[PDB]
Amino acid sequence: GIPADNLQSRAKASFDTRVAAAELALNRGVVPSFANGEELLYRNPDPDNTDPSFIASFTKGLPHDDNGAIIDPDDFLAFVRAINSGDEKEIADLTLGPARDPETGLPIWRSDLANSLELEVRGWENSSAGLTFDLEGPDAQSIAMPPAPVLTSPELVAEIAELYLMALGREIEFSEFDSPKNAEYIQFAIDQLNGLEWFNTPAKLGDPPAEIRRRRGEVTVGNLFRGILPGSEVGPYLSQYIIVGSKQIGSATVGNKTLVSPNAADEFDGEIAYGSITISQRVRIATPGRDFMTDLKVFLDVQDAADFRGFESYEPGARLIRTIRDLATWVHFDALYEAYLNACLILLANGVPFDPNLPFQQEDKLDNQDVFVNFGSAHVLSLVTEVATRALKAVRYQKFNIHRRLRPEATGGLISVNKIAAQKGESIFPEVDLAVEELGDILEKAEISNRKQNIADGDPDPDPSFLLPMAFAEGSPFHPSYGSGHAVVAGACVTILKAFFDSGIEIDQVFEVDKDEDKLVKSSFKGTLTVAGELNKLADNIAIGRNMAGVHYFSDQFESLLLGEQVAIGILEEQSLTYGENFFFNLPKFDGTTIQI
Amino acid sequence: GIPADNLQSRAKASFDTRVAAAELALNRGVVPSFANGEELLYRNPDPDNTDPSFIASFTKGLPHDDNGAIIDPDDFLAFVRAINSGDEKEIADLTLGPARDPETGLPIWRSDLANSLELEVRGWENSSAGLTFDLEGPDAQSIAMPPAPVLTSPELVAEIAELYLMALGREIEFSEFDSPKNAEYIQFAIDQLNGLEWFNTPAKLGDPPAEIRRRRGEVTVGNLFRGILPGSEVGPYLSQYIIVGSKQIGSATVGNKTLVSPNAADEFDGEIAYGSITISQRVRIATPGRDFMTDLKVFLDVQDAADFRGFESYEPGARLIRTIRDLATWVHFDALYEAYLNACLILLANGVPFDPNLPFQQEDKLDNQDVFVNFGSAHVLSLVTEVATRALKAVRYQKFNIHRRLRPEATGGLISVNKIAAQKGESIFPEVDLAVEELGDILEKAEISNRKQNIADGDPDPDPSFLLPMAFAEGSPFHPSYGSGHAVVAGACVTILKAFFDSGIEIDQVFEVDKDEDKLVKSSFKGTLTVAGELNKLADNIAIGRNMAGVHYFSDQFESLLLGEQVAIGILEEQSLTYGENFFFNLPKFDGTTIQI
Amino acid sequence: GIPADNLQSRAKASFDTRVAAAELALNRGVVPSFANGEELLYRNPDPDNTDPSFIASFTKGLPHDDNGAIIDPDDFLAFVRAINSGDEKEIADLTLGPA
Amino acid sequence: GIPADNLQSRAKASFDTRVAAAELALNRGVVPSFANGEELLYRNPDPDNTDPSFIASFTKGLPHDDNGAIIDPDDFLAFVRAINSGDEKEIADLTLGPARDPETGLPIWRSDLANSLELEVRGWENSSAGLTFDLEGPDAQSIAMPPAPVLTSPELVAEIAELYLMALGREIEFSEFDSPKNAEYIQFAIDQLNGLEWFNTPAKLGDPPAEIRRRRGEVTVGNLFRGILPGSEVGPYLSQYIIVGSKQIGSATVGNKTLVSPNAADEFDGEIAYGSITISQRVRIATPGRDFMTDLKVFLDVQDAADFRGFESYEPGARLIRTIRDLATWVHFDALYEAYLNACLILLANGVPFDPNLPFQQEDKLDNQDVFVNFGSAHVLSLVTEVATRALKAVRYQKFNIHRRLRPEATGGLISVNKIAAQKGESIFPEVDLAVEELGDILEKAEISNRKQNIADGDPDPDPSFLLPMAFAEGSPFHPSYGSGHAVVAGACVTILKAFFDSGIEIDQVFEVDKDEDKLVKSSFKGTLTVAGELNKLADNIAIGRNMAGVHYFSDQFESLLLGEQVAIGILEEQSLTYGENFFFNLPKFDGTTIQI
Amino acid sequence: NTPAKLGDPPAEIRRRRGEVTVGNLFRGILPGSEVGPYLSQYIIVGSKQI
Ligand SMILES: [Ca+2]
C-alpha cells in the first residue's frame, strides 16, 4: 500500500498543534542562573555579630540606619522568602518603611520635606511576577542573565563614573556635543573615562565570555553615552523613529497619478499619522537644572519607601527631544511598548515593505493576494505589543528571584557615606574604596552641584554630599536593578520589527534637531543608515535613557536587551506551527548573524 | 498516611500548564455554522442554462457583466475551493480582474476615469486566515455567527434603507441632530424607517432567537443611527473616549499637596497624555459632500478589482469629530486596536481604579504590593492589543469559509440595475423587487444626489443612477460583508477593558463637540454615565462608522460584537491557569449579565 | 525474590532496538543554523528601487544582467520558497535560463 | 470545522518516521525455518553407543578420525551451544584442531606437508552474526530458507555429480564449449547428468513447492553449468558486465557537438572508467591444472583446521576471464559487492537512464531539476553497497543457527571413504551408497586425475583417492554450506540495480572473449539481451563460480539468491517513508513478476 | 599576517591560518596534512598483490 497521512477533526488538530508547541518549548531544555556572590560575602562590621550586611543587594523599602544599611537582617531574609513564594499574606506580613506615629498612624521621616508632605509608603511592584507561567514563548525561569559586576570591580567603577557624568551633563543638547561652548565639560567626561582600566585596557584570556562581549574600549565624542548594538554608533545620537513624523493622509499614488496631502509638512514637524488622527513626537519639559535626592535625609526617606511620585515641576508646552534630561523624561512615563509601536506606525505610513520571505508580498496581479490579518499590518501590530509581558516575566525572575542587585542611587549613597567618613579618619563601606579613590575629580564636581541643589531646596548651609543626583523625585522604581524592564521590552519589540519588515531597507533622508530652534533639520552625516540599524538605535535610546535618569548601569541594559531577543525568537518559533503557508521570518540578531524562523 | 500532592521540575509544570489550557479549550466542544441558503438558491435567468447566478455572494474581483453578475460561475466555484484550501499556487491560479491589453499588459476598464489612471488590480486580503490555528483562545473554527439576512427579507429592506439615509446625511453634524435646521431631513429619515415592517412590527413567537435579540423597534431622534449595546442609547452620540483628552503630566497628588500641570488645559482640548508625549483626538477632514462610485461604469470597475485606494481629497488641518462623514474617515485608516488603546490610555492617566477583585489593589501600607507586569498598567496594555488577531481569525472563517455575503455596495448595484430596467418594462434581479418597491422616496433622493456628483466628476449629462454613494473611492475592503473586522476587534477589546478596570465607576463631567467652534462644550445631559457604558458606546461608534461609510449592514456589526466577546472571554479563562494568586476578573457582558473569570 | 530482567520474542526485541536508537538520536537535541546576514544586506543600487540585489547569494541558473546581477528579485525569492517546500510542480514553475 | 493535519517539530517528525519504519517491519510478522532432519537421523555405527554421528553437518575445525567423522560428539554439541549464545568466552572454550606437541605448542598434523609448514589452526568466521540486529531492513531471523537436500536424495546425487564434472573441466575455455577439441569431455558431462533421475524425470504432485521451483530438466550445451535466473540461459555464458570496459572521459555530447576520447578504445579492452582513473577486468591467472586436497591426509588436516590460506601459485600477468578455473579465482578474493559496484559503474559511464518512475528524470528545461544525492548516481552507489551486510546477517542465521549443512569437500570425503572400503568388502557411510552406485564413470575419472595430482605433489606411488578436487588450497571458508555469502549479496545487490535503473533498456553490442587471443570479439548471437537479464546473469556467474571452485552446491546458490532479493525489497519499503516526493521503484523480481515500491 | 583577537567567533579562531611557507602552501590543516609529501600515500601507491 502507498504510505499516507490521515486527517482528524479540526478540534483535535487545534489541540495537537498547541501540545506540539509546548513540546518544542520543553525540548529546548533549561539553564541555571548564577549570581555574583555579594549577598553573603559582605558582613556587618560590628564585633560580636554574625550577620551579612546585604549592602550590595536591593533593600529599598526595608528600614535603613543613618548610613543606609538595613537595621534588621531578618527583614531582608523575609523579603527573599516572600519573593520565592508569592503568597499574598506573606507579602502583607513584611516590614515596609520606618516607625509610625501612634496618634496619626503616619510614618516618621528623617527629612523636614517628607514630614511636611505627610508622605505614606509605596510597595514592591510584582515581586513574584517571576513565578507566573505563560501560554506562549520560553518560560520565565528557563533562561538566564549572567552574574552582575561586583562593587570592587573595574567594571563597576567605570559604570558609576559614567552615571555621575550623565547626571552632571543633563542640560547638554544632543545636537551640541561637539560645540566649543560644551568643549570643557565634554572633554572632561572623555578624559575621565579613558583614565579608567575598564576602558583603557582590554579583557584578558580566561575572563568570562559575557564580560568580553560587553566590554568597551576608547571613549570618543562619537561614542560618548551611546550603546553598542550594531547601528547605534553610526550617525546622529537619536534614532530617526523618536524625532521624525510620517507621510500623511492624502499623500498617495493612484495608478499613474501622484496626490499630495494638504498636511504633508506635518511629516517634518514631528507628527506621526495615527490612523486618521496624529501622535506628536514633542516631549514634556522638566524644569532644567532641578535634580533630586541630593540631601542625605531625603535620600534615606526614599530608601525607606517615602512616596515622592509626582513631585516634579515642568515648563509649559512641549518640544522635540533636545537635552539629555528630555530623554530621561521620555522614559519616566512611557507606556510599555510605546516607542516601538510608534516606529511601527511610521514604517507602515511610509510604506516600507514587509520581509520578502513572507507570503503574498508580490504585486497582486502575480499572487492574487493582499495582506492584513496574517503577514500584514494587523499581524505586526499585535506581535510587537504581545511579546512585552512575556519579556517582563523573565526579567522579574532575574530581578527578584536571582540577582537582587542594588540600584545606582544606593551605590552613590555608599560612596558618599564612605567619602565623608574617610575625611574624619574613619572607614565605612570599604567595598567602594576603589571608586572613591579613583573618581576624585568627578565627586568634587558632584559635591559643588549638590551644594547648589540643597541651597535652592531651602537649606542655606548644607552638609557636604557626594550623592548621585536623580532625575526623578522618587529615584528608581520599587524593584531591583538587574535586569531592566525598559531594556527587556526594547530587546523583544525591536526583534519583532527587524524580523517582520524588510530590515535591510536604507533610510533616504537623515534628520536631527536644530541647534537654535525647536524644529528638524537635515543632518550633514555622509554615510548610509538602514531600518534595522535605526531600530537597534531606538532600543539603545530608551535603554540608556534610564541610565541618564540615574536608575540603571550599562550592564543591566545590554544583558536585558539580549534576554528580550531570546523571548521574542522563542515566541516566533512556537507560533510557526500554526500556519499552513510556506514562509519564514529573516531576523538579523544583535550579534550580527541571521536566523531563519 | 496523610493525602498529598507533589512537586515536579519547573519545566514540567510549565509544559503541564500549557497542555491543561489546551484541554480546557478542547473540552468546550464545537458548534457548526449555518449559512442562509442564498448561494445555490438564486439561478441564472437564461433558459437552457444550468448555473447558480451567485448574485447575493461576495464576488468582488471576479469578472462581471454589464449588469454586475459574474460572467463565469467556475470563477466563483474555484474561489471557494481556494478559500478552503489556502494553497498559495491555487490562489495565484484564480481569475482576477477583466481582460488585459496584449501590448501594454494592463487591464481594460469600462470607465474613462479608471483607464486614464491606468489602474492595476488589487487582491483578496487573507482569504484563508480562517484555517490558521492559535496558541491561545478558542480556535477560529470552534464558534459561529448565525445565518445572514436574505435579500427578500424585511430585515434587509430595513438595513439597506438605513444605509442610504446615512449616505445622504453625511454632512449632518452630531451636535445638531435635534436642531431646527436639520428637522426636515431627520424627520424624513425617521418616518421612512418607521414605515418599514422590520421596525414597526415586533418579532413573532417561533422566529430565530438571534433575530429576536437584534430586531429594533420604533425609530426616534434619540436612537437614530445608534447601536443597541447597553449604554449606547443614553447621553450624547459619541463616546467620551473619542473626543476628550486626559489629565496631563504635572497634575498629581503628593501626600497632602496638590500639584497642577502647566498644561492642564490640554485635557479639554482633546490631547491624550501618551507617556511623556501626546495623542491628538482631531481627525483629518475629507472634502465635504464628495462621495464615490455614483457612476455605473466606475462602480463596475471597482467590482472588477480596479485599485482606487488613496484617491480622496482633504481640507487643511484637523478637527474634533464633527459630521457623520468624519466618523467614516476615522474608521477608514484606524490601526486595529486604536480606539480601545486610546481609551485605555485616558483611563490610566485619569487614575481610574483597576477591577477591585484583582490582587494588590489596596493602599500599599495594607498589602505591601504595587502593580505593573501582573494586574497593572503593562498587563492591561498587552491584553487589549493581543486579543485582536485571535478575533480576526474567527471572523475570517465566517467571512470567507462560511457565509460569503455581498457588501452593501453590491446590493445597491442590484437595486439600481433593477429600477432602471423596470422603467423600460424589463425585469432584472427580481430578488430585490421588495426594496425597489418600498424605498421609492429614498431612491429618488439618491438619484438627484448621484446626478450632482457625476456632474462634479465631469460628466456633462449623466445617465440616471440609484447606486449607494460610498464615502471611500475604493468602496469596501477586499473581503466579504459578514462579519466585520472592525466590529469583531471592538467586541474583544472593550470586553478586556471592562473586565480589567472597575467598569462601574461613574463619569464626572460629560462633554460634546461645540455647535459654533472646534472645541468641547459641557453637555446638558442629566443622568449618570459609567466607564462600562461609554466603552460599549465606543465599540458601537467604530462599528456604525463602517455603516456610515457604506461598507457594512447593521446585522454584520451586532453579530460580530458578540463573536469578539466570546473570543476575549476564552483567552481570559485559559490564561487563569498561569497564576499563583487568588483573584478573578468581573466582566459585565453585552447581554446585561456578569461572568466572573 | 532475586531481581531479574526478562526475555521477549525476537521480533519485539528487534523493534525495541530500533526505537531505542531513534530515542538516543532524539535525546541529542538540536541546534539552530545562523547565516552571515548578506542575503538581505546588499541592495539594488538604483534609486526609487526597493529590492535586495542578492549578489552574494548562489543564483546560478536564474537570469542575470550584463554585470552578473539577477534581473528579477522574484526569481530568487521563488527559488528560496521551492527549496523549503520540495514540491515537484513548484520546482518546475521556476524561471531557468534566458529568453 | 474543516478536517486537518497538524505539524510538529522537525526532531519529532524524524523520530516518528524511524518508529513508523520499525512498525512496518514488525507488522510483516515472522516465519520459522525448517531443517532437513539429518542432524539427529544418522547415528554412530558402533555397537554399545547412543550417539549421533553428525556426518552430514558442518564440523570443519572439530577433530576428526581417520574416516573424517568427528571423534567426540560433545565437541559439535558445544559448538551448537556457542552459535546460539554468541558469548566470547564460550567460543574461546571450544575445541579447535588436533592434539598439540607439548614442547613447541604446535598442532600435530597427519600430512608431511602440513607438518613441514608448521601450520596453525584457523577459526570460525562470525559463528554468531545471525544474532546481530539492524537499524534497517528485515531482521536476520524473520525470514527463512527451506530444508537442504538430504545425502540419500536424487537431488544431491545430481548436485555432487555436477561439482565433480566442473572440477574435471576447470581448464575448458568458455568460448570453446562447442569446439570439436572439447567434444568428448563436454558430451560426457551432458550424457552423465541426463542419466540422473533429478534431471531426466519431472517433480511429482505433492513434492515441496521449493523443490518444484528449483528442479532442472534436460541438460544441453546451451545450459551446461549455468544458473536458472531469467536471462542467464540466453546468449553467451559470461555477463557483459564482467568482461567489457566502459565509455571513457573525453567522449561526450555537448549540444550539437560530439567529442571523442583519445582513449576510446580502452572500452573494448576491459577498462572501466572509475571516476578519472580506471579498473581493469583482467583476472590473475592460477596455475592451470593444479588442484588441492586430493590426498586424504592433507584433506583431513584441512578438516581439522589446517590453515592453507595463501598457498596457491600463479602465472605472471592477467587476462580477461578465459577458463572455468579463472571464474573460481575471481570469486576467491572479491571484495563483497565488487561485481555489482563495477556493473553500476559501467552503467553510469555509458549513460543508461535511471528508472523512469523516479522523480526529475526528464530534460531539465521541463522539470528544472538534475539528480545526484536522491534519485541519482550517489543514491544508487550507496544503496548497492549498503544492502550487503544486511543480507549477510540473514544468511549467517541460516548457515549457523538453522541448517549447518556440510560443504561439498566433506561429501566427497564420505564418497571416497565409502568407495575405498566397499572394494575391500566393508560398509562405511552407507548414507552415500546411492551416489557411489550411480556415479561410477565420473569417480573413475576423478581417481585418475587425483593420482596425477598426488604424483606431482611428491608421492611417487599414491593410495587411490576419489576426493573432490578443490580450486583453493584451504577448500571452503570456515562456515557452513547453506546458504552462501556470495549468492546472498548477489541477490540483494542486483535487486537494487534492476530497481534503480531502467532495467528494460536493450544491450546494443554483445561481446565475448576471443578463442585465440586475450581480447574481446563481437558475439554471433542473434537475439536481444536487456540490462536486467545481464544483471541476473552476473549474479548467477559469481554464484556458480563458487560451485566451480568446489565450495557450494546448486541448491545453496539459488535459495540464497531468493533470500537476498527479500532483504533488498524490505530495505526499499522501509526507506520509502523518508521522502516527500511522489515516486516508486519498479522492480522485475527473479520469479518474472514486478513489484512497485 | 595577524592573529585572531579575543572575542572573535570560536569557529574563526579554529580555522584561521598563520604564516604561509613552502611547506604549508596550498595544504589543509587536518593533523597529519602538513608533515611529509603533499599527496597522501593512498592516492599514488599500489598494494601487495595476489
Ligand atoms: Ca500580494
Ligand SMILES: [Ca+2]
Ligand atoms: Ca497595593
Ligand SMILES: [Ca+2]
Ligand atoms: Ca531532470
